[PDB]
Amino acid sequence: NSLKPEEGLEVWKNWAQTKNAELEKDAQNRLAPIGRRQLLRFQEDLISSAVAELNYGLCLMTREARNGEGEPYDPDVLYYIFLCIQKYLFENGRVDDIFSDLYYVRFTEWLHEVLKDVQPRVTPLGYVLPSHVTEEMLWECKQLGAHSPSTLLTTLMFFNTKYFLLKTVDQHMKLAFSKVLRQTKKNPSNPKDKSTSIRYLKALGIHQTGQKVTDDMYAEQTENPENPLRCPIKLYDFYLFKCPQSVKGRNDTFYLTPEPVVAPNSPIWYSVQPISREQMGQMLTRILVIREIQEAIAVANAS
Amino acid sequence: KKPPIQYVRCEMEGCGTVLAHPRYLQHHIKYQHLLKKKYVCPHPSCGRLFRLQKQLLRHAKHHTDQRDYICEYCARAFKSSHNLAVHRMIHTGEKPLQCEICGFTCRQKASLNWHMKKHDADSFYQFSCNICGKKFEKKDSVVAHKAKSHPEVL
Amino acid sequence: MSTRESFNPESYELDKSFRLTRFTELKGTGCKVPQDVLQKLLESLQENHFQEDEQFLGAVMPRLGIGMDTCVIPLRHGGLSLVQTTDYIYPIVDDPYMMGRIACANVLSDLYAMGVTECDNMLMLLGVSNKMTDRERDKVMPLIIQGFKDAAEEAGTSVTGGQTVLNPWIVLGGVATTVCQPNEFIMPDNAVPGDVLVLTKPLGTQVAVAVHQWLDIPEKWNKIKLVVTQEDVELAYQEAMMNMARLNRTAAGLMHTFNAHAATDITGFGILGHAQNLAKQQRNEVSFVIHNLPVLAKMAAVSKACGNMFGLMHGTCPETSGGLLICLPREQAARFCAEIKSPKYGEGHQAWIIGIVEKGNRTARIIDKPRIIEVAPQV
Amino acid sequence: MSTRESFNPESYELDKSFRLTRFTELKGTGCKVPQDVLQKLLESLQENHFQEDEQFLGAVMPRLGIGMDTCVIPLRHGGLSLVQTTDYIYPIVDDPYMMGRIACANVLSDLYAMGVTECDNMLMLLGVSNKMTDRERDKVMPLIIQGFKDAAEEAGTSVTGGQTVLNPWIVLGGVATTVCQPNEFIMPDNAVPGDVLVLTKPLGTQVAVAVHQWLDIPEKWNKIKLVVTQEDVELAYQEAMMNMARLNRTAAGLMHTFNAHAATDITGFGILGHAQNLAKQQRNEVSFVIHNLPVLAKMAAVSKACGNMFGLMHGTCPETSGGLLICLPREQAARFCAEIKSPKYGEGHQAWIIGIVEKGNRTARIIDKPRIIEVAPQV
DNA sequence: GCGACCTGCCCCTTTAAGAGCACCCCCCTCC
DNA sequence: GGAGGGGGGTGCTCTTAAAGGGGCAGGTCGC
Ligand SMILES: [Zn+2]
Ligand SMILES: [Zn+2]
Ligand SMILES: [Zn+2]
Ligand SMILES: [Zn+2]
Ligand SMILES: [Zn+2]
Structure with missing residues (x-):
């Protein structure tokens, strides 16, 4: 799976002990945010830590994470380290989603400003350095799919970026329920089957008297029958199955702020207030750094 | 403090109404016949005319958008209590009215009026409004028609 | 159990004159005449200055999760949380079994306000009156304890300790x-304009309790005998006892299903005081408005007849083992009442949408002329 | 503050006639007169015929850790154990500040019996009185709350939430x-013959508080004037008000370090009653005998001067926020007293060896004429 | 030749608003 | 003291019309 929780745990332990060293020297005794009065210390083991402490540590970890040689980490690899940390938390009983939950909103902002400046690196030889975070890393880490409303929203955004080729928040807001037309494919491969796909007209032009309009131009969604879990069509259908009935058919927005509390059998997962520009920008920078999105951007951009 | 019930009729021509108490006779006469007045709704474009002072206060509700009545079940907002009372019938699933020919049950008299067209009954109706010959059965229905439609306005 | 038949003192070797309610100075204002002052005292004991901790350079949930009830108090191990609540009510019903069940339900209702549908442990404080004779103590207290344990059993928890003191x-x-x-309880701090409040139990239980105890005092009954017949008082008392002895487990479970933003309980301070306390907690600038006030049948008439004693129309009448004031979106609320009335598990009960949520300054009010809904004594 | 001037009504504008203890009817006969009945009531509360569940083919701790106090309830996560306690003591001293401190200490002392040296959360039941003036409530209750919170600080926890009632x-x-x-609390089940019991606090607090309440009224002081004077009661009363407001954190911490088998707190039921209750959950078939009792200064003569109302020598005399009745081996115990007397951190306090553990019938008894060792206040 | 899609028109139901009576509340009253 | 009159404002039942969603029925384009 090329995802190593051990590396994330080790980096966290190194940073935690390093900070604890400085915590005593400052001689500023500040209590921990737990019921019992204790000196604020960062537990070396991730699992036995409070939400506030973990959030504050991951916030500082962005700027104080140090490589094995003592050099600061690159923006392309801090995201991988944090993904490994989250995988460690998930596989040890914790239910905290360090990227989506409201308590960790502070963490994402700092991670966001670290990741925004990133650009693909070109070596002196010439070839571009491939990113260290891949799609399977997100899939295995449960940052994509249909586990929680935020994860499903991020999955739809990721698929839209990959296929429809949306590469900027300002350009990416244009998407709406109405203009995203669903049309069952006219030609199934065999009469027994019935192919389905989703399309979007991302072409910008005068669009006057059938000009600039053609069937082969507007961006399209494929369908994955090999693994239904990752199928874009299934996730889109699930998304529309949980959004409120009133939202469908409106031109203003496509992404809805997930409801704070949701249960396994909750009919509705999303509110009717579209996600703010800040959140869309925060969760779009994290999905450009991924490798497959970079390849998709290059292929369409190149031609 | 309820006084004993007696019935007194407004002897004035054109008003054959009989009231539940002698007390109410004075109020009826004063507020209906003797008090001849004209008012204008303050709204810039309403252009309506109401002789009573009670009616205007109700009319102000129409022009504004203050909804102070909330349904128990669907949390829908209404402007008057009786509108809510009619709405609640949807949630309780009760159909009080019923046609006397085909046994067709409805929730409101507006639905029944539509059904009577199938069982053509306007033939036996005698009343009708002078303007557009509406062919009503009873008398006060003509007043309701003149109020909702053919309105008296400036 | 006393559910099969009404508690008869003679059946348990008790005299006819005996009544459990005689051991409390009942009053129309409840167990707290100066409601405002007790709010100040509760704020004083809750408020802690060290918990701010310079905000921890971030925005995280507080130890006093909402500052008014059901403190969360995060722990060390496993990042878990410790939601814990307490409550105490003096006897208000003659039946000891039902009174113990009511006390247990009131104790548990605080947790169900936060969406917690499971209780690991529960303690009990049992106080025996000085005036009660020895022959009564060993005949009523066992019934109270049996009722408390039965209520705990229905809640999936066990009473495994406590304390006993003279009073x-x-x-x-x-x-x-x-x-x-962290994902098993709803922290009631979210609220957005457009939501609709939902209530799970009718109000006016205190009025029904007080009236039922006025059937033995000739001076008080004649004042109120005019407006309400004895049969109405009997059925209202029965309904209030049954309602007050009911758990909100189903409501708490459904809270998660229908995306609840905030919730509380109506135990004490009336409906207006609890809404006011809840309004201050909301992060956003939202003020509640209550248009409907479900009341037990015929209790509103008594409430207005008695004068400035209860004031249900003012939302100040205290309640015991009250319902939940849940803030849900409009369509979820529309569905919420439908499911709670006929649950899949069965044994449903009605719920009402008593108001709306609008942009304001973190306050709660009641319209000038609330639409009093008379809930019938179903079955 | 601890050494600050005692609560003076004139200083805080209250009238000289004010007296905090006046709000309760102190009963020198006992903390709760029907203790033999109330112990049965508490046993009924703690009893559960279903917790055994065929014993589950194991000698694991029951759903109740000992079935008497400080229930140890296993949790679903990580094999953690939930430990709770509850206490309710009416005022017995005239300083509101120390009363909150004493209430907090009494509530905590149950945990320190099981060795738990850290507390996560603490609620508070603060019941104001109907027979209390409006100004008295505003000038008394805040002091009690502040004292309780300050005692929480020394305990290493915080007071979050609670409840307030009229009483x-x-x-x-x-x-x-x-x-x-599991490796943080000591289960009182274990014990072995050859052990010696240790008490970390002196007895006779109830006698001192009652006698100091008797100073005001002149018709009762007369019959005890011969045995002691008012100066002796002042020192004894101050000492009792100082010991019963002292936490047992040091006792709890040293319990682990010295291989303590079992321990319990002497609160309410008296030393004899608490020792007997301790002997009822020992795996071994052992019994306790007390050959020595450390009664407060001059508080042994006074009980004789009051006939059989107190009964301190018989061990039935109640105590509040009493010490710990730790059972230690003979070799370890001698060091435990030495360590507690002269702690490294400071705040020295004395402990005594009162009795021995001998094979018997799982019950505790006191010798015919226990020796009384007089403890005088330190300087 | 058959179908999908857009749109128009009618059907039946629900919401909105006026009419008037019975009622309450307050105030005043001269016998 | 007082029951009766005057003045005012209001809820409730009835009635009608207007708005609206659903469904049947055309004309146009595609296969
Ligand atoms: Zn007339
Ligand atoms: Zn108008
Ligand atoms: Zn409705
Ligand atoms: Zn018909
Ligand atoms: Zn007409």
Whole structure:
């Protein structure tokens, strides 16, 4: 799976002990945010830590994470380290989603400003350095799919970026329920089957008297029958199955702020207030750094 | 403090109404016949005319958008209590009215009026409004028609 | 159990004159005449200056999760949380079994306000009145304890300790605790304009309790005998006792299903005081408005007849083992009442949408002329 | 503050006639007169015929850790154990500040019996009195709350949440909780013959408080004037008000370090009653005999001067926020007293060896004429 | 030749608003 | 003291019309 929780745990332990060293020297005794009065210390083991402490540590970890040689980490690899940390938390009983939950909103902002400046690196030889975070890393880490409303929203955004080729928040807001037309494919491969796909007209032009309009131009969604879990069509259908009935058919927005509390059998997962520009920008920078999105951007951009 | 019930009729021509108490006779006469007045709704474009002072206060509700009545079940907002009372019938699933020919049950008299067209009954109706010959059965229905439609306005 | 038949003192070797309610100075204002002052005292004991901790350079949930009830108090191990609540009410119903069940339900209702549907442990505080004779103590207290344990059993928890002390008045209560993951309880701090409040139990239980105890005092009954017949008082008392002895487990479970933003309980301070306390907690600038006030049948008439004693129309009448004031979106609320009336598990009960949520300054009011809904005594 | 001037009504504008203890009817006969009945009531509360569940083919701790106090309830997560306690003591001293401190200490002392040296959360039941003036309530209750919170600081925890009620008598108490790992609490079940019991606090607090309450009224002081004077009661009363406001954190911590088998707190039921209750959950078939009792200064003669109302020598005399009745081996115990007398951190306090553990019938008894060792206040 | 899609028109139901009576509340009253 | 009159404002039942969603039925384009 090329995802190593051990590396994330080790980096966290190194940073935690390093900070604890400085915590005593400052001689500023500040209590921990737990019921019992204790000196604020960062537990070396991730699992036995409070939400506030973990959030504050991951916030500082962005700027104080140090490589094995003592050099600061690159923006392309801090995201991988944090993904490994989250995988460690998930596989040890914790239910905290360090990227989506409201308590960790502070963490994402700092991670966001670290990741925004990133650009693909070109070596002196010439070839571009491939990113260290891949799609399977997100899939295995449960940052994509249909586990929680935020994860499903991020999955739809990721698929839209990959296929429809949306590469900027300002350009990416244009998407709406109405203009995203669903049309069952006219030609199934065999009469027994019935192919389905989703399309979007991302072409910008005068669009006057059938000009600039053609069937082969507007961006399209494929369908994955090999693994239904990752199928874009299934996730889109699930998304529309949980959004409120009133939202469908409106031109203003496509992404809805997930409801704070949701249960396994909750009919509705999303509110009717579209996600703010800040959140869309925060969760779009994290999905450009991924490798497959970079390849998709290059292929369409190149031609 | 309820006084004993007696019935007194407004002897004035054109008003054959009989009231539940002698007390109410004075109020009826004063507020209906003797008090001849004209008012204008303050709204810039309403252009309506109401002789009573009670009616205007109700009319102000129409022009504004203050909804102070909330349904128990669907949390829908209404402007008057009786509108809510009619709405609640949807949630309780009760159909009080019923046609006397085909046994067709409805929730409101507006639905029944539509059904009577199938069982053509306007033939036996005698009343009708002078303007557009509406062919009503009873008398006060003509007043309701003149109020909702053919309105008296400036 | 006393559910099969009404508690008869003679059946348990008790005299006819005996009544459990005689061991409390009942009053129309409840167990707290100066409601405002007790709010100040509760704020004083809750408020802690060290908990701010320079905000921890971030925005995280507080130890006093909402500052008014059901403190969360995050722990060390496993990042779990410790939601814990306490409550105490003096006897208000003649039946000891039902009174113990009511005390247990009141103790548990605080947790169900936060969405917690499971209790690991519960404690009980049982107080025996000085005036009660020895022959009565060993005949009523076992019934109270049996009712408390039965209520705990229905809640999936066990009473496994407590304390017993002497008191001039019988004091009945407990303490409920639960250690839960961060995703098992709804922290009632979210609220957005457009939501609609939902209530799970009718109001006016205190009026029904007080009137039923006025059937033995000739001076008081003649004042109120005009407006309400004895049969109405009997059925209202029965309904209030049954309602007050009912758990909100189903409501708490459904809270998660229908995306609840905030919730509370109506135990004490009336409906207006609890809404006001809840409004201050909301992060956004939202003020509640209550248009409907479901009341037990015929109790509103008594409430207005007695004068400035209860004031249900003002939302100040205290309640015991009250319902939940849940803030849900409009369509979820529309569905919420439908499911709670006929649950899949069965044994449903009605719920009402009593108001709306609008942009304001973190306050709660009641319209000038609330639409009093008379809930019938169903079955 | 601890050494600050005692609560003076004139200083805080209250009239000289004010007296905090006046709000309750102190009963020198006992903390709760029907103790033999109330112990049965508490046993009924703690009893559960279903917790055994065929014993589950194991000698694991029951759902109740000992079935008497400080229930150890296993949790669903990480094999953690939930430990809770609750106490409710009416005012017995005239300083509101120390009363909150004493209430907090009494609530906590149950945990320190099981070795838990850390507390996670603490509630508080603060019941104001009907027979209390409006100004008195505003000038008394805040002091009690502040004292309780300050005592929480020394305990290493915080007071978050609680409840407030109206009660003819002032009621002060709370619930202390702790989610602790299996290697953090000492289960009182274990014990072995050849051990010696240790008491960390002196006896006779009830006698001192009652006698100091008797100073005001002149018709009762006369019959005890011969045995002691008012100066002797002042020192004894001050000492009792100082010991019963002292936490047992040091006792709890040293319990682990010295291989303590079992321990319990002497609160309410008296030393004899608490020792007997301790002997009822020992795996071994052992019994306790007390050959020595450390009664407060001059508080042994006074009980004789009051006939059989107190009964301190018989061990039935109640105590509040009493010490710990730790059972240690002979070799370890001698060092435990030495360590507690002269701690490295400071705040020295004395402990005594009172009795021996001998094979018997799982019950505790006191010798015919226990020796009384007089403890005088330190300087 | 058959179908999908857009749109128009009618059907039946629900919401909105006026009419008037019975009622309450307050105030005043001269016998 | 007082029951009766005057003045005012209001809820409730009835009635009608207007708005609206659903469904049947055309004309146009595609296969
Ligand atoms: Zn007339
Ligand atoms: Zn108008
Ligand atoms: Zn409705
Ligand atoms: Zn018909
Ligand atoms: Zn007409």
